[PDB]
């Protein structure tokens, strides 16, 4: 069901600090190679009065290269699909909750996302639009009651050269019955999420991700 080349379509809506917005996107990737591109339009509420960077991780788990024979919870979940829900907490107080549904319809991946961001500081780099994209990061995934949890800290680059850190807590849930899933143990996903293009003080954005799943590649004593 998951071919070597796949397309995706996405619908996103929500609010950040009482600012309403809506996006749509389409893209393609190579799910077994862990690469993908999404071309995103802000269609309502734009240009956004906050940094688009805080929405970046809300635009795709089917496109992770699961190496070393790690069971692939995401690719296994089709045709039924899967969901994820995340709370991202910024060190200066912003909190952004994202809820997502992933389905497969007529050979295309379909994403539906709802966003609720609150308490971003009015004078901070997010609301002031003083961000410059994300550093690479490693997410740890681990089984927890029939689904997976993920944890990562990400660093947001800032105008002037500093960083603002946030913490991501995600739960990934399959729509496939447990009986039909081979669960992985604990593992890690290295990611590089990059902005390739922006047009119109950020109403059009192209993003690229490469994502590779691995175990810890250090020798063990146990």
Numbering used by the authors: 4 to 62, 66 to 228
Text from the published report:
They are widely used for studying biological events, such as cellular trafficking and endocytosis, and have contributed to the development of innovations such as multiphoton microscopy, genetically-encoded sensors, and super-resolution microscopy. mKate, a derivative of eqFP578 from Entacmaea quadricolor, is a bright, monomeric, far-red fluorescent protein with excitation and emission peaks at 588 nm and 635 nm, respectively. Structural characterization of mKate under different conditions revealed the pH-dependent trans-cis isomerization of its chromophore, a discovery that further aided the development of mKate variants with enhanced optical properties. Using a structure-informed approach, we introduced a minimal set of two mutations in the chromophore environment of mKate.
The loss of fluorescence may be attributed to the non-planar nature of the trans-conformation. For GmKate, pKaPT was determined to be 9.5±0.4, by fitting the 598 nm-absorbance pH titration profile with a first-order Hill equation. pKaTC was roughly estimated to be close to 4.0 based on the crystallographic data at pH 4.0.
